[PDB]
Amino acid sequence: KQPIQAQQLIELLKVHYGIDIHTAQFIQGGADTNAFAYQADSESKSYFIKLKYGYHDEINLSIIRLLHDSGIKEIIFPIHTLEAKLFQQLKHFKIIAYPFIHAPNGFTQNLTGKQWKQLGKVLRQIHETSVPISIQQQLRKEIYSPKWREIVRSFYNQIEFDNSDDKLTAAFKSFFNQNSAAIHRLVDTSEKLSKKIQPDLDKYVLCHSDIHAGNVLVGNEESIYIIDWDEPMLAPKERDLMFIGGGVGNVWNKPHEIQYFYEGYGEINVDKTILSYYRHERIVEDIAVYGQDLLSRNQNNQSRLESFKYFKEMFDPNNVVEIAFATE
Structure with missing residues (x-):
């Protein structure tokens, strides 16, 4: 090839x-x-x-x-x-x-206070970067798509007993059923918040879109590096800010990290409705993707078990779901 x-x-x-x-x-x-x-x-x-x-x-x-x-x-x-x-x-x-x-990335090696400040400084630099119109036309725009919310709702009726389910599918349905209240809340909150947000393209900025700990490397000179620039976008700054204290990967969920970050970022007027929308919606997106991998037999079982572990971890103490709910 x-x-x-x-x-x-x-x-x-x-x-x-x-x-x-x-x-x-x-x-x-x-x-x-x-x-x-x-x-x-x-x-x-x-x-x-x-x-x-x-x-x-x-x-x-x-x-x-x-x-x-x-x-x-x-x-x-x-x-x-x-x-x-x-x-x-x-x-x-x-x-x-x-x-x-x-x-090493931020999962592997936790950021120092100095690095948290530097991350805040750099992300503010990115958000304030003037984007030429030619490039704006090439960037995807936040449109609050209901695509993922719809997919998770399509799962509701599939959670029913099915004699043909394999081990992983049955285990996933059991877990979904046991956490049904939290799952509907994630979807319904994302939906409710999307309806309350009045899109204002004039407030969109250049966003990384998936800036979790895995995408920050600590390198030479103990300086940080932001990686994975494959799918940036124009969206409210909260698209990126939701990750600070967001708990993705069971890290970046501590108060002092938030303090150091904002000391570097400077701008403390953060729209809580948009920030809460993204934290709930990103989880909805993952429930749709990993949930479908468990309801289907598209990948081998070793790969499906990894998806299942990822799916369950979202519901662990201090992980993304608990932090999202605490935001609302």
């Missing part, structure tokens, strides 16, 4: 980046969807290369460039091509080169 043989990277990295690589190897399952990852090493360093088919504008690259030129420092930026571009466009595919870095 690969557009090139790994050794063809030697020629390409030399030509377009001026880098001499002595060894390149395909990285299995590293990339996802339309992407192929490779490890290419220079006698001096190691590089992570991503190839993507196509010549259309990738929103990730457009936004990464905007933040780069805007001065945001806390991003792991691509290595520049010799023409000073963040990626090399070839005839039928693109090359995106990055330094091969290992940095």
Whole structure:
């Protein structure tokens, strides 16, 4: 499926980046969807290369460039091509080169107070970044879609006994039934809050959209880096703020973290209705996705059990559900 043989990277990295690589190897399952990852090493360093088919504008690259030129420092930026571009466009595919870095994320290594402040400073920088109209036209907009809420409601009648259910499906239905009150509350609260929110496009800002602890790395100089810029969007700032104290992954649920974050972010006028809407809606989105994986046999059972564990963890003490309810 690969557009090139790994050794063809030697020629390409030399030509377009001026880098001499002595060894390149395909990285299995590293990339996802339309992407192929490779490890290419220079006698001096190691590089992570991503190839993507196509010549259309990738929103990730457009936004990464905007933040780069805007001065945001806390991003792991691509290595520049010799023409000073963040990626090399070839005839039928693109090359995106990055330094091969290992940095623990916020789950692995909890942020220090200083890092919480830096995260607040950087996210405020991002939210205040002026977005050129050409790029605004490329960004998805928050439209308060009822898609996920509808899917979870479609599950209601499926929770009924079915003689053909397998072990995982039956266990999931039992758990759903035992937590039915909380599940309907998540859906109904997200729905109620969406109805009360009057969309104001003038207040939308550039948002990461999924900035949980797994997407912050603590790297060189003990500085933080925000990763996964694949699906940014224009939406109320609360789309991102909901994660501070949000408890995603059973971390980022402590009062002092919130204090340090806002000392850095500065803006304390946060719309509580929109913040509560996102915390409930993000859980609804996950119940729809992981719940469907349990009601269906689309993935193997080892994978379905992982979805089940994830689904249940959302209901643990101090996890996302309890924090969402506490927000409302």
